[PDB]
Structure formats: C-alpha cells, structure tokens
Swiss-Prot record:
Induction note: Expressed late in the viral replication.
Chain residues that bind substrate: 32, 104, 117, 132
Protein's organism: Enterobacteria phage T4
The protein's name in its UniProt record: Endolysin
Similarity comment text for this entry: Belongs to the glycosyl hydrolase 24 family.
InterPro entries named in the record: Endolysin_T4_type, Glyco_hydro_24, Lysozyme-like_dom_sf, Lysozyme_dom_sf, Phage_lysozyme-like, T4-type_lysozyme
Phenotype when changing residue 20 to A/N/S/T: Complete loss of enzymatic activity
Lineage: Viruses, Duplodnaviria, Heunggongvirae, Uroviricota, Caudoviricetes
EC number of the protein: 3.2.1.17
Length: 162
C-alpha cells in the first residue's frame, strides 16, 4: 500500500466532470475543479488544467497526471506549513500517508481546526487522537472514509485499507 493507492481507493476515478460529496465540480481522482455552481466555469477550469479543449472529458492518463500533481502539491503544502510541518515530521511513514489524505481532501485550511488533534498526534497519543478526530464535521459527513484514515492514525498500519 501507498499514498497513491490509498487515495485512489478513497477518491475513485471518473473521467467525466462530476459532483463531489459536497456538490462541487470535480473530475479524475478527486481533483476539485471549482466551488462555483457553473458547469461552464468548471469546464473552463478543466481546459486550463489539461491544456486543451476537453469538453468536460479527459483520458485516464490525463487523470493520473492531475493526481500526481495534486499529490505533490499536498506534500509540498504540508512542508511549507509551519503548523503542519512539525507534526508531519514527527510521524512514521504510514501515518504521514494519513496526514496527506486529509490535506488532499480538505486542504491546508480545512485541516486548520484540527489543532487539538494535531497536538495529540504530535504527542503520539493515538487512541485519544482517534477519538478527537471523530468529533468533527468531516467524520459526520464522510464517515466511512474518515474511519479508515482514523484507523490508520490510531494503528499506524494499512489494515483499514486491506
Ligand atoms: C492531519 C494530521 C496532520 C499532521 C501533519 C500534517 C498534516 C496533517 C493533517
Ligand atoms: Cl492544476
Ligand atoms: Cl464516506
């Protein structure tokens, strides 16, 4: 198992513009195109990202190219984040994957109100953090996915994904 496989399972793969769990236009492997309600805005964002007139449809290759860029961006974001970096650096390789999944899904900004969980994680208090992470909108909204990421932090193994 790895970050790419882990996110591919959590995000799935769609080659035509769709709406995410929050109703935002997305495509590929969880690549958010826009928050705006305009499909056209979404199709324009799409062409701009791909570099061609896509018409709302991309290839598998193109989807995967976006995925790579997004995986990289996320890590790079965590590393530039002063609030995040230190936590992330304290973690073992499996848990780091879990931390990227979260940022990938909700952004640096989404992962902001997680201060108390961050601190518990940094402290290596797994069970307590597991509990704290569950008390969140994220958990209530996407419970199955949240349980997986949580188990991953709790255990430090890929069990939830196997
Ligand atoms: C959730 C935990 C954590 C730890 C380090 C970096 C980013 C994240 C997100
Ligand atoms: Cl992009
Ligand atoms: Cl879910």
């Amino acid at each position: 198992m790895n970050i790419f496989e882990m996110l591919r399972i959590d995000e799935g793969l769609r080659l035509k513009i769709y709406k995410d769990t929050e109703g935002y236009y997305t495509i590929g492997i969880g690549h958010l195109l826009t928050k705006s309600p305009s499909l056209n805005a979404a199709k324009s964002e799409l062409d701009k990202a791909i570099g061609r007139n896509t018409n709302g449809v991309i290839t598998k290759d193109e989807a995967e190219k976006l995925f790579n860029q997004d995986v990289d961006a996320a890590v790079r974001g965590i590393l530039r984040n002063a609030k995040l970096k230190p936590v992330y650096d304290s973690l073992d390789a499996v848990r780091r994957a879990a931390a990227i999944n979260m940022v990938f899904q909700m952004g640096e900004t989404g992962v902001a109100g997680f201060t108390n969980s961050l601190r518990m994680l940094q402290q290596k208090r797994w069970d307590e953090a597991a509990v704290n992470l569950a008390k969140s909108r994220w958990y209530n909204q996407t419970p199955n996915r949240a349980k997986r990421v949580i188990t991953t932090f709790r255990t430090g193994t890929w069990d939830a994904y196997k």
